[PDB]
Amino acid sequence: MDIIFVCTGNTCRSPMAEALFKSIAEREGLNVNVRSAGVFASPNGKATPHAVEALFEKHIALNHVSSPLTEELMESADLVLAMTHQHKQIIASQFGRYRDKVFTLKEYVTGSHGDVLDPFGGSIDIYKQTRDELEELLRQLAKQLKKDRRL
User: Fold this and answer.
1) DSSP 3-state assignment of 84?
2) Would you list the domain boundaries of the chain?
3) Which residues are catalytic?
4) Which residues contact 32 (CB under 8 A, 6 or more apart)?
5) Contact (CB, 8 A) for 51 and 127
């Protein structure tokens, strides 16, 4: 299926999630298409240096250019996983009637209310904590996606 990760800038959390999940998915043998976008993103932007360094440590390349979320992306996605509950709210105010496909990453994976907080402006250690937080969620996501018919 088509999965999109969404954050604010599409510079830290969602690009990290996309790169981490693509790696996990290919190991697990998952047949999914993965993208990321931001609710307040510019195009041509890049992943922040700390996000790049955090993934580089785990031998994953984060070569990323920022993309704004658009109606076209929202229509075509099978699943939209937002970092925060506020991101869900923005998605609902700016785009079409797609509530049924939009969930926070924590909601969808763990069943509980929870946000993946913005690491932007934080130290490399803040980013590495975000990376680890994402990794654990995304490993579970992979296992869960196996339970989806027509995956």
Assistant:
1) coil
2) 2-151
3) 7, 13, 118
4) 1, 2, 3, 25, 145, 151
5) yes
Cα–Cα distance, 39 to 88 (Å, whole number): 10
Q: How far apart are CA 75 and CA 70, in angstroms?
A: 9
Classify residue 53 as exposed, middle or buried by CB count within 10 Å of its CB (0-12, 13-18, 19+): middle
Residue 72: count of CB within 10 angstroms of its CB: 9
CA dihedral over 79, 83, 85, 86, signed as positive or negative: negative
Superfamily of domain 2-151: Response regulator (3.40.50.2300)
Count other C-beta atoms under 10 Å from residue 34's C-beta.
19
In which order are the strands placed within the sheet that holds 33-38?
33-38, 2-7, 79-82, 102-104
| Residue count of the chain | 151
User: Measured between alpha carbons, how far is residue 133 from residues 2, 17, 69, 115, 141 in Å?
Assistant: 22, 10, 23, 11, 13
Gyration radius from the chain CA atoms: 14
